[PDB]
Subunit: 103 residues, 7 copies
Amino acid sequence: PTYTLYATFDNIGGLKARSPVSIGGVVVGRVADITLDPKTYLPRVTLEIEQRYNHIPDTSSLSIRTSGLLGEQYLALNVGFEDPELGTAILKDGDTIQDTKSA
Amino acid sequence: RTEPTYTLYATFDNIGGLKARSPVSIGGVVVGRVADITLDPKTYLPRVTLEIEQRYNHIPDTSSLSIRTSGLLGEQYLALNVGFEDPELGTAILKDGDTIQDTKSA
Amino acid sequence: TEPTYTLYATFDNIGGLKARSPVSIGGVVVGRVADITLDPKTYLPRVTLEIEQRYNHIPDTSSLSIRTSGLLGEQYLALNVGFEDPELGTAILKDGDTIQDTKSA
Amino acid sequence: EPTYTLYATFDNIGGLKARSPVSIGGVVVGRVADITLDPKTYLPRVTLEIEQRYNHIPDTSSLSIRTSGLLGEQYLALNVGFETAILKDGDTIQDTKS
Amino acid sequence: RTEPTYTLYATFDNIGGLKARSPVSIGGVVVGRVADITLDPKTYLPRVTLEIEQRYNHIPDTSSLSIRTSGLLGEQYLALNVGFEDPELGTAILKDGDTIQDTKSA
Amino acid sequence: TEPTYTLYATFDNIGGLKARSPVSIGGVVVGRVADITLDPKTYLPRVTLEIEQRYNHIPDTSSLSIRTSEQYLALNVGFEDPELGTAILKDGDTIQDTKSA
Amino acid sequence: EPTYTLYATFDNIGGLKARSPVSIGGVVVGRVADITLDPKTYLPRVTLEIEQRYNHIPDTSSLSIRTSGLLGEQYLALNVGFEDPGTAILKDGDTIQDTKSA
């Protein structure tokens, strides 16, 4: 199964529904839906991440990037670095990835 | 069914490769499409008729439209840039039949 | 169908222009090339254009340029609405008139 | 359509072939009837058939080999020279561009 | 016929367009295949499981793996660069179950 | 009457040239590549050309160049000299000057 | 046409494959019969089948990997080696020692 994460971009470019979310090239989730935020009119992406990948730090970032010859776009989730002395919080169902890089 | 929409107009100097069914997008998200393109008989300037999805009916009249191109197929589209709001300063919301005054041709 | 009126234009070279080629203002098609013939006296290409009558306030200072569309190299006529001067009064193009200012391929 | 004959010599005819069009300002006025090498100089001589209605071409006119559209098909562009003497059946266009 | 094989592992930062059954080659000659790609659960780093033909069982542990692209279709593969051996120190050979430490991501 | 006569030419490399490849002068086709063979003694490619018989005044100073339109042979008519009277190529002769591609 | 066998080692065979042509001056004289990695050197070894009529190839000849026209298909250009007024001729089973990769 999966859990939900949100992320806001200034521009989603060629991103679409079912666009893959990957970590190190490995698909770990997918874009479930894309909506304009009703109050800010900023694109918000709704992600469905496979539940086995449930130790993602909230310091992680999302980048829109392009794969192969067809110009297919995807989300690169870069696992942010945490420091056990400082104790970084883990992303949970319904949480938002705050750090994003648009296209 | 088809999603309900309302009409907005916009005048450009040149519409370029824009055509019917050309998409209108905000931040890359499609919110409407070009319903029709006609030359204004009195000004001889191209007027675009847009159909915008009714859920996006809080677009300030300070918003702008820009003609831009998407990837490999050379498809052109309208990039709608959301304007600044402030009711005190009298920034009105766009309604059915209104015109987007600020446009950038390409 | 929209009725039309006719205008003439002479070019040095009409290039890939052909019958039914579109005439546009600001990218909006307002007419088409009805016919292309060589002038018997000058041997210069003369294009016969059909313009929609609703657009019958085109200044005689307007110009025609042969231009290309991106995807296939198909050619068309771009009509640039000429400058008018409130001081001088608007000399408008009528059915059968000729556009003097032209730019060939 | 009736026609009359004109000749022209080039250094290289490139992709020019039989049935290739001859045009003035993009308007087709004739066709390549034949392509032959001059027996003494071995320079390509093109034989053109021009429609008789276009019989006021000055001998100061020139011929240019040019390419049209996407397929690289070549044609002859006849550029009317500034006027003088008119070209008649059997005459040669002196000025050519390969 | 089919060649028997032994297993090697390799970790990358990014495997890019690499997939299962992606080829492993030395000097353009295919000597193995990607058997599996899994994200390490504690580190979330891609771990590639390689099957190398047993006849090529004298690969030094100083060898490297690079992700590279093949001609027209953008197909990716693993280029195994045979590592430097040292007559003075005697470099250790990779055997079944070992890990290739030197890797170059995309 | 025979439609063509034979000429030979050796190149270092014939490239994409093949049988039925055209031979042209100033873009006008005057012959065809009949065959391509390696000289058994030198292992250098030798092309065999069939030239239309009406083109029987080609000077032996002429050259052959491999060019692209698919590849073809451009025959460049060689310089003649009224003083020396340069020899004309006949059936079975060899074009000495060649340009590979 | 029958054939005889020749071997050649490269550092990298690139886009070369079985049935890739072997040519002299653009004329095809053989084909690549097989490509295998040498278990002892871990260098690609190419097995060539050459038409028997071309049996006067000096052992000083070289092999180069090269590209043909528009599709990037690769081939082997056999460069006929220098003989000296006496170089040994390559026979069935011999190896072309001089090779140049792409």
